[PDB]
């Protein structure tokens, strides 16, 4: 396939931000639940 | 401007109101079964009837009034109706499987016999036989209705279609009376389970088919059908014959062989 160059280029810095935000959106809420599992058990 | 013959449908809210009505009916049944309340269920049944009404109303608008049903579109609806009927056949096939599984291998709890100890089946030569002649006759009279319509005869189409509906209604009344008089119930083990769930779903399909025929009756009164274009009538006739054939299998299997 061929394509135009990016209309709104995403620099390495911007990719690191998008990748970081993405991973955190998965890891933090589940990490919060799992870390407090002991507090849920025993209720 | 298109230069194929197929129908691009206007954006419609009825898919969404039908989907929501399904949520409200299933939610509603849950609420009825477990939380002593019929409120959700009544709303879902209401939105379901409203959805069906406006959706099929719009199909009538699109075809009779706007002319979108070219031969290609009509051919597609024929396939769609045939496929739908096939899926309904397989649905009944699951209940016939349940019936034969239980009755061909009656467990000790039943007395090791079919009909179970303590079950007294209806006489298949009384009301069940009458029911059979009623649906068989309605299959004759709806074929008369179809030929009258194709031959351009409005009055005899209406007479034959009215006879067909009347017989459908007679069957439903006879079946409701048989249900009330039956000395066994749905809670009478697997005999009552298979009897009432299989004939009960069949009864629901008789009601649906009679409703469909009644829709065709009023479309005919309003001159919607031409002598060559009347797919709603054909579909209701195919569905009606399906309901007839399922009855014949129920009659032979559950009422006669299973008695």
């Amino acid at each position: 396939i061929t394509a135009k160059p990016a209309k709104t280029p995403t620099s390495p810095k911007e990719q690191a931000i998008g990748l970081s935000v993405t991973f955190l959106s998965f890891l933090l809420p589940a990490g919060w639940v799992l870390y407090h599992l002991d507090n849920y058990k025993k209720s | 401007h298109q230069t194929h013959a197929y129908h691009m449908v206007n954006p419609s809210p009825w898919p969404l109101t039908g989907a929501l009505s399904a949520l409200l009916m299933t939610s509603g049944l849950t609420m009825w079964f477990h939380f002593n309340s019929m409120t959700l269920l009544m709303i879902g049944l209401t939105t379901n009837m409203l959805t069906m009404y406006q959706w099929w109303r719009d199909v009538i608008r699109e075809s009779t009034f706007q002319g979108h049903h070219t031969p290609a579109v009509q051919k597609g609806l024929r396939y769609g109706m045939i496929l739908f009927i096939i899926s309904e056949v397989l649905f009944f096939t699951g209940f016939f499987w349940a019936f034969y599984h239980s009755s061909l291998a009656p467990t000790p709890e039943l007395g090791g016999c079919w009909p179970p100890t303590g079950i007294h089946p209806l006489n298949p030569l009384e009301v069940p036989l009458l029911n059979t002649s009623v649906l068989l006759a309605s299959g004759v009279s709806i074929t008369w209705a179809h030929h009258s319509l194709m031959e351009g005869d409005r009055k005899h189409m209406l007479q034959a279609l009215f006879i067909t509906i009347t017989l459908g209604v007679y069957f439903t009344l006879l079946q409701a009376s048989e249900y009330y008089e039956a000395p066994f119930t749905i809670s009478d083990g697997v005999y009552g389970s298979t009897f009432f769930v299989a004939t009960g779903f069949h009864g629901l399909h008789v009601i649906i088919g009679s409703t469909f025929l009644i829709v065709c009756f009023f479309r005919q009164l309003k001159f919607h059908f031409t002598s060559n274009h009347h797919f709603g009538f054909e579909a209701a006739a195919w569905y009606w014959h399906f309901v007839d054939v399922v009855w014949l299998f129920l009659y032979v299997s559950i009422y006669w062989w299973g008695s």
């Binding site: - | 467990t107 000790p108 709890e109 039943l110 007395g111 090791g112 179970p116 100890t117 303590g118």
Partner: protein, 79 residues
């Protein structure tokens, strides 16, 4: 005593994995025989083989339930 009973022998009427009917048949047979022998005065000892087989095969809880229902008048098999 045409026995020396170890356990219930293979029964060609019930050769497959589901043995429910073997248990049920020998239970029915024992109680049918005991009813006929108890009527005409005879000795239930002629019923012994059916008794041994169904006791070997049948779950305790089934026998117990079937015994209760026969006493209650609700046993659905024919004896």
């Amino acid at each position: 005593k045409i026995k020396n009973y170890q356990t219930a022998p293979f029964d060609s009427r019930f050769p497959n994995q589901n043995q429910t009917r073997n248990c049920w048949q020998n239970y029915l047979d024992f109680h049918r025989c005991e009813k006929a022998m108890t009527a005409k005065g005879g000795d239930v000892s002629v019923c012994e083989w059916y008794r041994r087989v169904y006791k070997s095969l049948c779950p305790i809880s089934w026998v117990s339930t079937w015994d209760d229902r026969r006493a209650e008048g609700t046993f659905p098999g024919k004896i």
